Amino acid sequence: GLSDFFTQLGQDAQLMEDYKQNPEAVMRAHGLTDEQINAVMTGDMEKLKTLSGDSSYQSYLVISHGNGD
């Protein structure tokens, strides 16, 4: 639901432009809850992960270092 919507929105320029015209109307029509929408509107990515079923996904993204070879 939350994941299906984000995956479509990220790929589909038609939906992306609908979303930009009216974020809450697009989100409501794709079944997002008021708490999911509030998390999006306040930029709370941490809470969005929880409402998606995170199951504490741990995500460190450093794939290089500065200490030379």
Binding site: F6, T7, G10, Y19, S59, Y60, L61, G66, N67
Partner: protein, 262 residues
């Protein structure tokens, strides 16, 4: 067996190249390093045979040198290639931009006689130029890893857009912690003060990973960097401290001056 390393970009689902997505779809097995659970879900729907390289990072407060984490990622990729699998390594961003694992895996696979290559992807720097409306060509660009800037001898050109990558671990010499200290950032500030005033506006940048998310674009004086909130994904942009000045020596050899420039 064979290897192809691809990038997924920073945004969920839409920022991979058309060909890179087709490489993931047709792979026997995918080794992933992706930003979040939405991206992981997206990948698993494309190709269910996924090994999550995140498992090789220090777990539960263990002391582990990231060099050992990277070696273990490379070894897991190569074990699949050596077994005979058509293997794809799917990293976020560009698989060879501030990312040692794909270059090391491709070097090792070629040396063992396998086919290996790297497909370019959209990195966090490519997102920054778009999100800030800055062309790296306007007065030129310089990129360093922040810790390498502190540990080794590097001289920035202060007419360029300077990027310090991995600013959150600036000065963390052990490669065993996930973040640095405010005291270490204060030493970086003093070092940068050779070329940049303490009140010089810098930008903490983070590319969005979700289509509903705005990037982080936080402007602050360089002096305030040590008190700022940083994450592993944070990049420090240092805009030019000086305007471009006329290279009279070269202009004279060319037989021209400023007034001749089109």
């Amino acid at each position: 067996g064979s290897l192809v390393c691809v990038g997924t970009g920073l945004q969920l689902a839409g920022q991979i190249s058309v060909l890179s997505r087709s490489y993931i779809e047709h792979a026997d097995i995918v080794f992933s390093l992706l930003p979040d659970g939405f991206s992981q879900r997206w990948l698993t729907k494309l190709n269910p045979n996924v090994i999550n390289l995140q498992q090789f990072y220090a777990q539960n407060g263990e002391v582990k040198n990231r060099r050992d984490t990277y070696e273990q990622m490379v070894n897991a990729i190569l074990d699949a290639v050596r077994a005979g699998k058509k293997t794809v390594c799917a990293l976020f961003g560009h698989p060879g931009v501030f990312a040692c694992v794909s270059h090391m895996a491709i070097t090792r696979a070629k040396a063992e006689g396998f086919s290996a290559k790297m497909e370019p992807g959209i990195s966090a720097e490519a997102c920054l130029w778009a999100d800030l409306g800055i062309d790296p060509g306007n007065s030129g660009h310089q990129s360093f890893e922040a810790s390498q800037f502190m540990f080794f001898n590097h001289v920035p050109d202060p007419t360029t857009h300077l990027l310090l990558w991995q600013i959150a671990i600036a000065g963390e010499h052990t490669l065993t912690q996930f973040h640095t200290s405010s005291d270490r950032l204060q030493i970086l500030v003093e070092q940068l003060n050779q070329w940049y005033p303490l009140d010089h506006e810098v930008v903490i940048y983070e590319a969005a990973n979700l289509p509903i998310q705005a990037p982080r674009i936080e402007r602050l004086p360089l002096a305030n960097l040590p008190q700022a909130h940083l994450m592993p994904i944070s990049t420090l942009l240092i805009p030019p401290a000086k305007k471009l000045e006329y290279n009279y020596a070269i202009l004279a050899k060319l037989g021209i001056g400023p007034e001749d420039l089109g």
